Ligand binder design. Structure first.
Ligand SMILES: [Cl-]
Ligand SMILES: [Cl-]
Length: 162
């Protein structure tokens, strides 16, 4: 298992514009298009992102391409972030995947906002961090996915995904 297969399980794959759990226009593997309510604003962003007139539909290859950019940007954002970098640096490879997953879903700002949990992860207090991570809107809104990520942090194995 690796970051790519992990996120592909959590986000799924859709070739036509859809609405995410929050109601925002998305496509492919969890690629947010816009928070705007306009389907037209969404198609416009889509065509801008792909470099062609898509009419709201893309191919598997195009979806995978957006996905490769997004994971890359996720990793680079963590490494540039003064709050995240130290945490990331301190973790083992499995747990690094867990924080990349959070960033991909909620953005760097969001994760950087989990101050207490980040401090607990850095100190390697696994059980305590898992408990604090669960007291969040994130956990309440997408409990099945949050549980998987949390278990990954608690155990340091890919069990939740097997
Ligand atoms: Cl883009
Ligand atoms: Cl969920």
């Amino acid at each position: 298992m690796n970051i790519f297969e992990m996120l592909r399980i959590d986000e799924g794959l859709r070739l036509k514009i859809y609405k995410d759990t929050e109601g925002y226009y998305t496509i492919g593997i969890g690629h947010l298009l816009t928070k705007s309510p306009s389907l037209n604003a969404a198609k416009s962003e889509l065509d801008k992102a792909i470099g062609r007139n898509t009419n709201g539909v893309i191919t598997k290859d195009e979806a995978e391409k957006l996905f490769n950019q997004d994971v890359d940007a996720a990793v680079r954002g963590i490494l540039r972030n003064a709050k995240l970098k130290p945490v990331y640096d301190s973790l083992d490879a499995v747990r690094r995947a867990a924080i990349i997953n959070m960033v991909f879903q909620m953005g760097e700002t969001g994760v950087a906002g989990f101050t207490n949990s980040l401090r607990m992860l850095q100190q390697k207090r696994w059980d305590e961090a898992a408990v604090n991570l669960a007291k969040s809107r994130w956990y309440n809104q997408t409990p099945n996915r949050a549980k998987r990520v949390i278990t990954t942090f608690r155990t340091g194995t890919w069990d939740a995904y097997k």
